[PDB]
Amino acid sequence: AHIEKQAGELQEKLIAVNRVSKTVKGGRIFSFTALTVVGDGNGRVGFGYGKAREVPAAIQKAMEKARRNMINVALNNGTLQHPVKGVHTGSRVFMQPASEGTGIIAGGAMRAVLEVAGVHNVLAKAYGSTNPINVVRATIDGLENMNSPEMVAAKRGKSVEEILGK
């Protein structure tokens, strides 16, 4: 939709779902919380934390915040040449340029998440907090600056940005 990458129909990658209440002043919260990541395999910055009165709405709200006001990010399937050294809120990730010929190893739900995120081959092991919410931020904060250049003139490319910077 709009300024978004060439996804076709939506990814519906639900990682978690929960229900939270203080129950301090007028009974419990009936509302649910939801975690969803939406990519396209080619690179997106889509990540959505949402909440609603009930579970169907919590997930659908969370997915809506994951597909609106997202830039397309233009990496070549699973290969990327310029990641960022990811930090997001104490949860730390460390991607580097890499073959896709080697495959991807990751425990828990992360080998299914990294693939729809399109950043799976470049990833290397996390450190810091192991919260689900901020560990998957590899394709969001790890692309806040990036390129994946295919031109043979790649080292005169930054030269090309400089004479436009004059």
Partner 1 sequence: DSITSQLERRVMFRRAMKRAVQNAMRLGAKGIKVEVSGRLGGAEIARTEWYREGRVPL
Partner 2 sequence: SMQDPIADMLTRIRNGQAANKAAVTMPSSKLKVAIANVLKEEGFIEDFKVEGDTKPELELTLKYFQGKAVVESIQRVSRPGLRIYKRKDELPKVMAGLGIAVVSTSKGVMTDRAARQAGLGGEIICYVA
Partner RNA sequence: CGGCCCCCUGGACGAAGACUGACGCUCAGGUGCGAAAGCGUGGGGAGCAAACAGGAUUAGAUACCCUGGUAGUCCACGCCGUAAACGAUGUCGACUUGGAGGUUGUGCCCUUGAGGCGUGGCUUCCGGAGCUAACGCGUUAAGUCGACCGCCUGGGGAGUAC
Q: Which does 158 bind (CB under 5 to 8 A by kind): RNA, partner 2, partner 1, none?
A: partner 2
Q: Which does 165 bind (CB under 5 to 8 A by kind): partner 1, partner 2, RNA, none?
A: partner 2
81 and 149 in contact (C-beta within 8 Å)? yes
Which of 103, 95, 43 has the alpha carbon at shortest distance from 74? Answer: 43
Partner in contact with 90, chosen from partner 1, partner 2, RNA, none, beta carbon below 5 to 8 Å by kind: RNA
Among 12, 97, 100, 127, binds partner 2 (CB under 8 A): 97
Residues 66/36, Cβ–Cβ less than 8 Å? yes
Give all strands (DSSP E) within the chain, no chain letters: 13-19, 32-37, 47-52, 87-88, 91-92, 127-128
For RNA, give the closer residue by CB, 96 or 131: 131
To the nearest whole angstrom, how small is the minimum distance from the Cβ of residue 55 to RNA?
A: 27
Pick from 20, 74, 90, 144 the residue near RNA by CB under 7 A: 90
**Residue 109 interacting partner from RNA, partner 1, partner 2, none (CB closer than 5 to 8 Å by kind):** none
Q: In what order do the strands lie in the sheet with 32-37?
A: 13-19, 32-37, 47-52
Fill in the DSSP letter of residue 89. Answer: T
For the segment 68-87, give every residue that binds RNA (CB under 7 A). 87
Q: Which residue has the tokens 């990327």?
A: 80
Q: Point out which residues bind partner 2 (CB under 8 A).
A: 81-82, 85, 97, 145, 147, 149, 154-166
